[PDB]
Coordinates of C-alpha atoms and ligand atoms in Angstrom, one line a residue:
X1 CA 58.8 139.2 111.9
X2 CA 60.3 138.9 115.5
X3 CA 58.4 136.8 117.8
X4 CA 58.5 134.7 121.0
X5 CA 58.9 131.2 118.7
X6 CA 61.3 128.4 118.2
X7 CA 61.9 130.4 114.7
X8 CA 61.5 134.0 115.3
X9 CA 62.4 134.0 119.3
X10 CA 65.2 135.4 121.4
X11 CA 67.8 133.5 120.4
X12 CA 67.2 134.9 116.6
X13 CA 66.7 138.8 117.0
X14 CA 70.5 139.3 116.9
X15 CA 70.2 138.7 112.7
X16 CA 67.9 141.9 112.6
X17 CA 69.1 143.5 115.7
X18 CA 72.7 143.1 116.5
X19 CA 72.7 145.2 119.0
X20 CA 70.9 141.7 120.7
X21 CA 74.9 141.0 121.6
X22 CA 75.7 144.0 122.6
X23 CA 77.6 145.7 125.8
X24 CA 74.0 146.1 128.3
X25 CA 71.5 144.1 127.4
X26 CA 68.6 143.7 129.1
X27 CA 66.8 141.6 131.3
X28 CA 69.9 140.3 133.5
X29 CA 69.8 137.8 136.4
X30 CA 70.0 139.8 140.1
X31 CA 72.6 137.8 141.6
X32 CA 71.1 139.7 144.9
X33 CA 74.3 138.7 147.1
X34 CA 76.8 140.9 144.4
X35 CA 74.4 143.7 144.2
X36 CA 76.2 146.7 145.7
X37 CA 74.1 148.4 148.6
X38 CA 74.5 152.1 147.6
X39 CA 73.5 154.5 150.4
X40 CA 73.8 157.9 147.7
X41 CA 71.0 156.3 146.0
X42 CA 67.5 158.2 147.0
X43 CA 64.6 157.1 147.5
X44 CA 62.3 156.1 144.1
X45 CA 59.6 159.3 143.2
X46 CA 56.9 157.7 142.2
X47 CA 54.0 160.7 141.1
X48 CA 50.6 159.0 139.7
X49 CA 47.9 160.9 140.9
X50 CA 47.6 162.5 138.2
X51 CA 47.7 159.6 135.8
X52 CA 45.8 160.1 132.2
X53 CA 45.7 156.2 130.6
X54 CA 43.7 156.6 127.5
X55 CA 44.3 153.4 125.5
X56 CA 45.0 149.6 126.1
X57 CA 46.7 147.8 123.0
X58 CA 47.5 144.0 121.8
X59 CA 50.7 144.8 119.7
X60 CA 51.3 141.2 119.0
X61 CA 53.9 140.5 121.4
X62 CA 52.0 142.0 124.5
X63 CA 49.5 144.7 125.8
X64 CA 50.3 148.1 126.4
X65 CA 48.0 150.3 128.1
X66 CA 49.3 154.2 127.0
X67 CA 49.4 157.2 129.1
X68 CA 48.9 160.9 128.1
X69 CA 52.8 161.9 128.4
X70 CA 52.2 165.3 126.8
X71 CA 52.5 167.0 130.1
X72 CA 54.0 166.3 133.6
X73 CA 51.0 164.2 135.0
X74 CA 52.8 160.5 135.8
X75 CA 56.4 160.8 136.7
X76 CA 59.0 158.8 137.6
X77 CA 62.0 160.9 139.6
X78 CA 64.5 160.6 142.4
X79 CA 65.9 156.9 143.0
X80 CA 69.4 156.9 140.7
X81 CA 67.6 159.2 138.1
X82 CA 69.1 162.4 137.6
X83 CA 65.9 163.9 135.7
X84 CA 62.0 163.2 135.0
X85 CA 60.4 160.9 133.2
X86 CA 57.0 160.5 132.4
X87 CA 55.1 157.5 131.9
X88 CA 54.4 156.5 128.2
X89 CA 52.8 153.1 128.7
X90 CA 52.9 149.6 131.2
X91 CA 52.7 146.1 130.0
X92 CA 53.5 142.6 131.0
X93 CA 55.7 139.9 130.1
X94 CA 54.5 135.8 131.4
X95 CA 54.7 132.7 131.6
X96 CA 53.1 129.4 130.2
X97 CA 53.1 128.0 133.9
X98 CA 53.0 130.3 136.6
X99 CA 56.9 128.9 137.4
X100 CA 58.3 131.1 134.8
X101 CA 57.4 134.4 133.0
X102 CA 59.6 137.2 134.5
X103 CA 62.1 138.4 132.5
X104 CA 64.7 139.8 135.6
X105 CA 65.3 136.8 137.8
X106 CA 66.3 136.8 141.3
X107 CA 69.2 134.3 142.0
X108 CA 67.9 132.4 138.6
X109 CA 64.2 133.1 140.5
X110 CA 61.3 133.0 137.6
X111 CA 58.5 135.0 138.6
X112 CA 54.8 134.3 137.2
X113 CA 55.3 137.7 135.2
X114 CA 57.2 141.0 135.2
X115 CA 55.3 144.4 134.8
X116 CA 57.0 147.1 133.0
X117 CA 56.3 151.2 133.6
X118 CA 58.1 152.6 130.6
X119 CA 59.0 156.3 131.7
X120 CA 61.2 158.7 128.9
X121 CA 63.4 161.7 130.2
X122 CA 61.8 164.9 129.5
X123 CA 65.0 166.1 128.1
X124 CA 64.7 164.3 125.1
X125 CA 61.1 166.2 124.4
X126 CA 59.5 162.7 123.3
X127 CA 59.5 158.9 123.1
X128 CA 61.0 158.7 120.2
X129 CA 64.0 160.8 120.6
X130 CA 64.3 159.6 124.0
X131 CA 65.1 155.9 122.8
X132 CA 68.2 157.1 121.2
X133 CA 69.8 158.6 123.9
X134 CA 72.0 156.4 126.6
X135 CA 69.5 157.4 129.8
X136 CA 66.3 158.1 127.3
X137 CA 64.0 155.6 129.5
X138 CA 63.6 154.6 132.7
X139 CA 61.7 151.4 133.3
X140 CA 60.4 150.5 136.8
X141 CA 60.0 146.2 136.8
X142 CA 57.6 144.9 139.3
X143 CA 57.5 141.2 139.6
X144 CA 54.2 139.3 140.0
X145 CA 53.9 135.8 142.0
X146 CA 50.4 133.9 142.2
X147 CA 48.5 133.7 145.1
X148 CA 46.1 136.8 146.0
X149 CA 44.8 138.8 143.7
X150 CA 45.8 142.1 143.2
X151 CA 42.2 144.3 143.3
X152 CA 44.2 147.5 141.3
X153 CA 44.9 144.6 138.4
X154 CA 41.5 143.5 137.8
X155 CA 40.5 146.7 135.6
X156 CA 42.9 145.4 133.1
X157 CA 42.0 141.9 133.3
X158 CA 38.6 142.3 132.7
X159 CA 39.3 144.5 129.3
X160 CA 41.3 141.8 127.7
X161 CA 38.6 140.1 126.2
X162 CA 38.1 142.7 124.0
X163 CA 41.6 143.4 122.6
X164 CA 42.2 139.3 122.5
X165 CA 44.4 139.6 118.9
X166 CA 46.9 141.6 117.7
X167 CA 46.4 144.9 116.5
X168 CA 43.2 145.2 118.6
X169 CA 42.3 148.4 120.7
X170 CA 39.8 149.6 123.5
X171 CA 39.6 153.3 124.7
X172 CA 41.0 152.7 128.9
X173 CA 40.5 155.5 130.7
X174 CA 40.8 156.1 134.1
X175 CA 42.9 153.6 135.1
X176 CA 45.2 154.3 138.7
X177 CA 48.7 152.4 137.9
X178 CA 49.0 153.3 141.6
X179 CA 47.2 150.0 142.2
X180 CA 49.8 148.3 140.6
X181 CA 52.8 148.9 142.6
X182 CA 53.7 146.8 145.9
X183 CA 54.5 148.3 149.6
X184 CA 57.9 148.7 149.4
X185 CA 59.7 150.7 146.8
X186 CA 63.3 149.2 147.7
X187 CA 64.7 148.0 144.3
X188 CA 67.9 146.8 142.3
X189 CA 69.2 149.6 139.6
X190 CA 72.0 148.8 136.5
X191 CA 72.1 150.0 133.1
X192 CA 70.3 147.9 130.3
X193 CA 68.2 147.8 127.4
X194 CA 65.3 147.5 125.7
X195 CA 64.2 144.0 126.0
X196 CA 62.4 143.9 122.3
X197 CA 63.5 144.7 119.4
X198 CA 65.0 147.5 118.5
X199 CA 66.5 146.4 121.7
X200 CA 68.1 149.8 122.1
X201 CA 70.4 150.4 125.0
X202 CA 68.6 153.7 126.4
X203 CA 67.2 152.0 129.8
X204 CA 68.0 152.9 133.2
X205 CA 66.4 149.4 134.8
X206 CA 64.7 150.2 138.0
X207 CA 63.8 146.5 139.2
X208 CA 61.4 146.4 142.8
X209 CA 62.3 144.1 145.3
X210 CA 58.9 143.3 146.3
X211 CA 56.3 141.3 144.0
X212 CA 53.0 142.3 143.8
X213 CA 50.5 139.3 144.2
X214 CA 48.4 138.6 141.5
X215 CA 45.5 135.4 141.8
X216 CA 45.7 132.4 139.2
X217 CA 42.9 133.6 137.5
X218 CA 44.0 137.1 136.7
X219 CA 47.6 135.5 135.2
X220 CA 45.5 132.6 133.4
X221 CA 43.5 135.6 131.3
X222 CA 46.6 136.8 130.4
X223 CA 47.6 133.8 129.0
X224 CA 43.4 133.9 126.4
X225 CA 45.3 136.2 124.5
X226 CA 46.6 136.0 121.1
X227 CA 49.8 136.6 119.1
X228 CA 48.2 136.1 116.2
X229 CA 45.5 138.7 114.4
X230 CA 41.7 138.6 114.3
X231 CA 42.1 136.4 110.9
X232 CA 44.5 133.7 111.9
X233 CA 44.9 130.0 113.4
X234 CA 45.3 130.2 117.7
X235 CA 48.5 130.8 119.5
X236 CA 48.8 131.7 122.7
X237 CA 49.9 134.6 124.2
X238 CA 52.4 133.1 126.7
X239 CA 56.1 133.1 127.2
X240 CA 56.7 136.6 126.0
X241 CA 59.7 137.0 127.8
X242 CA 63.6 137.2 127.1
X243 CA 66.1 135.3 128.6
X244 CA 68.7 136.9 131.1
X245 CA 71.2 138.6 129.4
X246 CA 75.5 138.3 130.0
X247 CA 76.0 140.9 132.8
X248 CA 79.5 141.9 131.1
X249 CA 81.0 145.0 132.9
X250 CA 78.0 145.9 134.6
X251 CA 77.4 146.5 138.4
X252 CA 73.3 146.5 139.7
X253 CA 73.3 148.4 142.4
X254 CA 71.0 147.6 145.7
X255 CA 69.1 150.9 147.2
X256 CA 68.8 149.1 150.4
X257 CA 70.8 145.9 152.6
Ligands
E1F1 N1 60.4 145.2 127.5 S1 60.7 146.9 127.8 O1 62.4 147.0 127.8 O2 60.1 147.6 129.0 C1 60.1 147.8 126.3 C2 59.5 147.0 125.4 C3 59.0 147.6 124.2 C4 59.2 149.0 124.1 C5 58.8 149.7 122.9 O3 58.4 150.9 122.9 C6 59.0 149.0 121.6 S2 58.1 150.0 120.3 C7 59.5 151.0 119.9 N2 60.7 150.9 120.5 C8 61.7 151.7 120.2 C9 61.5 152.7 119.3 C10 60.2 152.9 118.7 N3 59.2 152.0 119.1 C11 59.8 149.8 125.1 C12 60.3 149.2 126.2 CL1 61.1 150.1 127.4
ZN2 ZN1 58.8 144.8 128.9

């Protein structure tokens, strides 16, 4: 029953999921001039060569395209991390209008969209067990602004046609999530949660500086899809994203000045 609507949205997920008001909830607002520069912090290990995607899914509330995780092939390592964690699955939170979407702001900043790279700690064994545990994930945010397109996003573009309600699937192999990521890998780091339901706090929030570009007509086929499944009256995929969240105790640290 959760959603993105005026009676199922954000501001309601706190009546099945407490936790919604809890001590480090996710996303959060970079106030970019607080943000400690931290010069312990290494440099982000980002290893996707060897990147297995298999599947790309409308869940209802976005897409997910899934990664073979059952062995070391895309890992995330090194930046505050103190272990591996491999890629599960990406997918996207946007906007309505291109002036909102994001989920992270900078200085209140709305991006067109954020990108999430869901990574678990191999510790745990698996996703599930993983989400449980206080540094289960680690999810690396990329924001998107509109104005050239990004070539390594098109792949996935062009598939969502086919997956257009929820609960739809198409096999997606092959696909580089190397494509995906900007230049730089400077980025903004603090302790949060899952920003859906079950809203679990388990995330180690790895937020990039620097937004990838994406064209207006790449974000406006995000915006075809559907919430609702194959049987069911129209609504728009758009404005899947959760306000910023109270920063309570919590410092975001900068890996760079
Ligand atoms: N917006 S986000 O914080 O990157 C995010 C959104 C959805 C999910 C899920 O996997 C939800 S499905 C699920 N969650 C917990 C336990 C069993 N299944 C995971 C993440 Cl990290
Ligand atoms: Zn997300």
């Amino acid at each position: 029953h959760w959603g993105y609507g005026k009676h199922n949205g954000p501001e309601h997920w706190h009546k099945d999921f407490p936790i919604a008001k809890g001590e480090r909830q996710s996303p959060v607002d970079i106030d970019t001039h607080t943000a400690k520069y931290d010069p312990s912090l290494k440099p982000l290990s980002v290893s996707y060569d060897q990147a297995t995607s298999l599947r790309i899914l409308n869940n209802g509330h976005a897409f997910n395209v899934e990664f073979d995780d059952s062995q070391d092939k895309a890992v995330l390592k090194g930046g505050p991390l103190d272990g591996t964690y491999r890629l599960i699955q990406f997918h996207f939170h946007w906007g309505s209008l291109d002036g909102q979407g994001s989920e992270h702001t900078v200085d209140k900043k709305k991006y067109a969209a954020e990108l999430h790279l869901v990574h678990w700690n191999t510790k745990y064994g698996d996703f599930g067990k993983a989400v449980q545990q206080p540094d289960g994930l680690a999810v690396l945010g990329i924001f998107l602004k509109v104005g050239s397109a990004k070539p390594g996003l098109q792949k996935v573009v062009d598939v969502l046609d086919s997956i257009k309600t929820k609960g739809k699937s198409a096999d997606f192999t092959n696909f580089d999530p190397r494509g995906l990521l900007p230049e730089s890998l400077d980025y903004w780091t603090y302790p949060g949660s899952l920003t859906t339901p079950p809203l679990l706090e388990c995330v180690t929030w790895i937020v990039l500086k620097e937004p990838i570009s994406v064209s207006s007509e790449q974000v406006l086929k995000f915006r075809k899809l559907n919430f609702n499944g194959e049987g069911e009256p129209e609504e728009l995929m758009v404005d899947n994203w959760r306000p910023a969240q109270p920063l309570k105790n919590r410092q975001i640290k900068a890996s760079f000045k």
